[PDB]
Design a protein around this nucleic acid. Structure first.
Ligand code: MG
Ligand code: NA
Ligand code: NA
Ligand code: NA
Ligand code: NA
Length: 320
DNA sequence: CGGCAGTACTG
DNA sequence: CAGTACT
DNA sequence: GCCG
């Protein structure tokens, strides 16, 4: 990053807009920061700034203030509530609306939340694991967790395929959580497996809390055995084999990469989801789908790129 | 002006 | 539904 | 916030 002295100041504003609910402005900032982090050389001119996609007049102005003064005056006027809103929205299951409500109600600390807030079932688990969920784990521990799930799944049906996606599959040295995708090549035997799989992972104490228990998605909490272990977030998705490539693509990410790819598909009259890549998609004036279109066959990730007119990118090149 | 990705789950 | 979450 |  050639522009740390700029992006460090910009990230502060972005986070402030985010926790305060100004999601589109925060999005704009996030995109400007990534763009700034990817420039080859320090940005030294307004006109150079404007030349970067993702940097407009308002943002170039801010970059200019930083270079000339080493500071951004807007930082001095960030609401005093922001550190508390961030504290609160780092509880899993609480977002900006809940954080703002707790703030309005007078809460200022996690002790206030613990003792006086009404928490959802998910938020109570999030609070119990507040520190742990803010920590990343070594890649090697994500391997142990993925293997734990795979061993439990394969015990039921040895044909089940399980793959850790997310940051793990993108090759990162640490992972915020573990994202396990499960399918079955025969196209049928993925069905109805959660009850038995989840029950199995509970039996020996690996699965400690459940956050979401859907027909296709599980989100919860696990902890490996022995001393020195922290609770870790674990997501499991079970998909039919026909959707494997799009599910793999979605669940490998990154999130920004997915949004970029999906926006591209939209420009070409297509739609990309975790279920499928579709063509001849009918939309309205607001970009909203009014007609479904046709599912395109995508046996592999490479086919999704191909049909979008893109060169294939290995997971490591998707870490946007 | 107005989209900014597309979807699953909860209560 | 609004809110939160996933990548 | 940026961009079509
Ligand atoms: Mg993840
Ligand atoms: Na630009
Ligand atoms: Na949260
Ligand atoms: Na109090
Ligand atoms: Na996850």
């Amino acid at each position: 990053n050639h522009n740390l002295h700029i992006t460090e100041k910009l990230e502060v504003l972005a986070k402030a807009y985010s926790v305060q609910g100004d999601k589109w402005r925060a999005l704009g900032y996030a995109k400007a920061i990534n763009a700034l982090k990817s420039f080859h050389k320090p940005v030294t001119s307004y006109q150079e700034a404007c030349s970067i996609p993702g940097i407009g007049k308002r943002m170039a102005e801010k970059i200019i203030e930083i270079l000339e003064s080493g500071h951004l005056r807007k930082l001095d006027h960030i609401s005093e509530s922001v550190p508390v809103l961030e504290l609160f929205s780092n509880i899993w299951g609480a977002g900006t609306k809940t954080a703002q409500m707790w703030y309005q109600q007078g809460f200022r600390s996690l002790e206030d939340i613990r003792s006086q807030a009404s928490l959802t079932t998910q938020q109570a688990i999030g609070l119990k694991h507040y520190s742990d969920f803010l920590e990343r784990m070594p890649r090697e521990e994500a391997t142990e967790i993925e293997q734990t799930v795979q061993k439990a799944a394969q015990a039921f049906n040895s044909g089940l395929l399980c793959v850790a996606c997310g940051s793990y599959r993108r090759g990162k040295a640490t992972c915020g959580d573990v994202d396990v995708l499960i399918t079955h090549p025969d196209g049928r035997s993925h069905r109805g497996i959660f009850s038995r799989l989840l029950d199995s992972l509970r039996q020996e104490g690996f699965l400690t809390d459940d956050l979401v228990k859907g027909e296709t998605k599980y989100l919860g909490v696990c902890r490996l055995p022995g001393p020195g272990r922290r609770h870790r977030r674990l997501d499991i998705i079970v998909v039919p084999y026909s959707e494997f490539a799009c599910a793999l693509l979605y669940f490998t990410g990154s999130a920004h990469f997915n949004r970029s790819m999906r926006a591209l598909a939209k420009t070409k009259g297509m739609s990309l989801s975790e279920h499928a890549l579709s063509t001849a998609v009918v939309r309205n004036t607001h970009g909203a789908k009014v007609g479904p279109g046709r599912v395109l066959p995508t046996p592999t990730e490479k086919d999704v790129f191909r049909l979008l007119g893109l060169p294939y990118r290995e997971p490591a090149e998707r870490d946007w």
